[PDB]
Subunit: 235 residues, 5 copies
């Protein structure tokens, strides 16, 4: 439990778009709101450039959310600051809360492979998929009640499945024990959305997922480039 290394805090803020209200909003007002929001992201982009954090915006398919802002920042107070600045934009009046997840990029800190994974510049992949997950603490299947070595072996097969889908799916695991309602946030990034299906399905047939995986909601979306943001809100 002391073996896990801790990088950036990560907020997945999923919002839904109040299209009806948004349409009511005058054109010039809508335009300003997009400008306002874009300048916000421009701030975030500066942070990313300084390697002081990272973000991703994805539009989510389905009705659980419309848009996902995924923010990685060094401090949790920074996260809070970003959420608050978002929420105080015009545009955010139309971005209703949908779901959020706070978590900490988790895997000595100095080593580059660790450094990259702990302070990850989020991949600009076509699609993203997010789900929070727990390890079952239920009866016979109680991961916590497992031996370190059992758990190690369990995680060995998990690593194998993951590794098959490396170079296809980038996987950012964030631990959220004591930050949120589940234990891990798994965020997958692929240029192919089907690879998410492929990876998560294969993984379920690993004892660790089969027996110990308790999952939250899955959200998949498509990258929203910032050049595409004006368009996406055009009514």
């Amino acid at each position: 439990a002391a073996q896990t290394l801790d990088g950036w805090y990560c907020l997945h803020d999923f919002r839904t778009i109040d299209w009806s209200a948004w349409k009511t909003l005058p054109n010039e007002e809508r335009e300003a709101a997009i400008s306002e929001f874009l300048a916000l992201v421009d701030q975030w982009e500066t942070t990313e450039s300084e390697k002081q954090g990272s973000h991703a915006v994805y539009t989510i398919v389905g009705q659980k959310a419309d848009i996902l802002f995924m923010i990685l920042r060094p401090t949790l107070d920074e996260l809070h600051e970003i959420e608050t600045a978002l929420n105080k934009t015009k545009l955010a009046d139309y971005l209703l809360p949908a779901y959020s997840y706070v978590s900490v990029v988790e895997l000595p800190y100095q080593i580059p492979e660790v450094r990259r994974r702990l302070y990850p510049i989020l991949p600009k992949t076509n699609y993203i998929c997010f789900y929070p997950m727990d390890k079952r603490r239920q009866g016979n299947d109680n991961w916590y009640m497992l031996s370190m070595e059992q758990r190690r072996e369990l995680m060995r097969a998990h690593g194998m499945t993951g590794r098959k889908y490396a170079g296809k799916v980038t996987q950012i695991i964030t631990g959220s024990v004591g930050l949120d309602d589940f234990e891990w946030g798994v965020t997958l990034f692929s240029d192919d959305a089907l690879q998410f299906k492929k990876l998560v399905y294969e993984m379920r047939f690993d004892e660790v997922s089969a027996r110990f995986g308790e999952f939250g909601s899955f959200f998949v979306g498509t990258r929203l480039p910032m050049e595409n943001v004006s368009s996406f809100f055009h009514v």
Copy 2:
């Protein structure tokens, strides 16, 4: 797990109708909204004609939803585009979100059989029934913890029950592992709604359903022809 073949992405977008608001809306405005929406579907119909996708609109009985748009498109980005275009219609101001399900038609791709099943033109049947389902990963009954051969045999009896209700119920199974909250979306199409009851009940007495089936909400509805859409929104 690598054996499943993958066709179209499928979005079931269920909405509820805000009749109260809709009535408030002036007549000519309502009329335009239906025109607007119909022209949208006309787009979708063109897509279906080009064999580049498929759709179905069904009005759902009960209060879980009012209307179900089921869209099959080759890419998930296309799905998202359709949802977004829907949501930016006037009519969609009155079509409140109710439930949605994203999934991928799942079952070499070149074969004329399987091509049909992977890229299915949705049946224009009188009724539809949708439910998402999982396989139980719970204690003794943990499908994932099952042998491939066990699972094979389990699915053998399932196929038998299905096959009895073939030529009555058309069955589109969509996998949604890593796309949505359950593992499969089952969409049934019949000219007789009772056949859904018949099929799903018989199926529950199969070990696979009896022991491994975890189900979501069931939605049943009636086909909304597009000629019937004007009428259905008439207030």
Copy 3:
């Protein structure tokens, strides 16, 4: 599973009353809305008279709902038509959705005892109680994983308990497998509401209920005569 005989579709539409809004509505407008709604029910009454369906309206105690329209119609498309006509009334602007249940009166069709039970004219009893129920498919207690004969014997004791409370509680069981979220809708009708408590409690001590019963929400209400409808909405 093929042994069950199928009568009318049954919709339990439970709504809550938006009293605050309703009061805001001018008196003459409120009056019209009640007239409008009453004329609707008058339609339904004509259907009942022709033996082409049945209905009941009950005001529900508690906050889960305010009013329950229970509609039995031959086709599910008819159900949908009724729901839609309800929803497009003025009054329905104030009857917010609360809960709904679709199901099919289930128990050769020609035989009168079957005919009566399959196409039941709903009892005009003082009180009603509704709850959806499932049979547990959970571990040791998995009704579906039970032998036909076991199930038969289970249902034998159930019939005994039911039969004690016959002539007091009328019981309409509707199957909703593949129509709704549970497997059965149980609707009880008695002139004495306590008989519901009596029946459902006694039943829980039957192995079938004790071990296999998974229940939904219970709703109990009081018959709303149509002569009483004007009064009930008077503000």
Copy 4:
């Protein structure tokens, strides 16, 4: 199951206060609303005086509710009448639904100790605590699948714990099997809120609670005297 004796119907109607709206309401209008509501309770007080029912109003701490009206009436139709009269008050425009529970005071009717317990004048204690409860029907722990004598012995230790906290906590158990979503409503009344913690905690270490108790939400509140009602709504 036939051994339980049945007294008054009991509605716990918990509401939340829409303070924002309430403040918007003009002063004289607010004043009238309190007058209106008070005159309602004055009706209820008359009922209590005639021994034809009982009530209690408690403001609930926390956000689950703001105010709890607990009404005991002889008939369920009377309950419904009271709820409906409440809901058609001005004040009730600001008393949003939060949670409700219907149940029947349960424990030969002629005997005074029974009579008192069946038709209980609710204690005017400083605090109240309410929670609905079930008996677990889950695997090994299935109370219904228990022998009458086992259950008897189980309830023997329960009575012991209760009896320790008698003269401190008054306990009104209402059965709601076939009236509501759980099996019992437990309402505790004490001049000391901590006695609720004391009683319910001690009780959990009784096999009956430890093994068979499934609980709903707990609500605790403070008596709202009627002379305190004007004050409590003062904005």
Copy 5:
């Protein structure tokens, strides 16, 4: 069960901010609302100074809440008074309910180490984390069905893990059995938010947490100094 000592009542009132509405509110009105709210807290600060209670305000990261007022007062009626005074502020019009938890600081009363722990002046730490928790009463893992000595030993290892993270994480456990929906509220205070992750994760590998821990939602936030309140609401 009689061994636990009882200090202050504790209300965690989590609210969300209605930023959209708040922005609509004129500047001078917003300013007054902050003044109004600050003067309220100034009251609370006076209470804290008199050692007659304590509070903390934290802004919560994520969408489950925006702001957490944690109030410890000697009486539950005082708690209720504070909640009610909050709710009747202008600002509270924009502080929508999100989640609340009532509980009693639990551990002779006179002993200073007890006194401090029972009547705790809440730490002005940079971050807070709150979650309610239960002890599992489920099958084999039924804490209540455990021997006092078993439980003692269970809690021994728990104390060890806690003690490691003492001087880093301050831990206020509040019992809420018979006050709220879970059994304990755990509130952690650290200058480092990661220490929460560290503590709660390590704790999960203790038999007591691994086997007996059932957790509610976790909320983490950042201290909102009162000098920072004007700023935080600035739009």
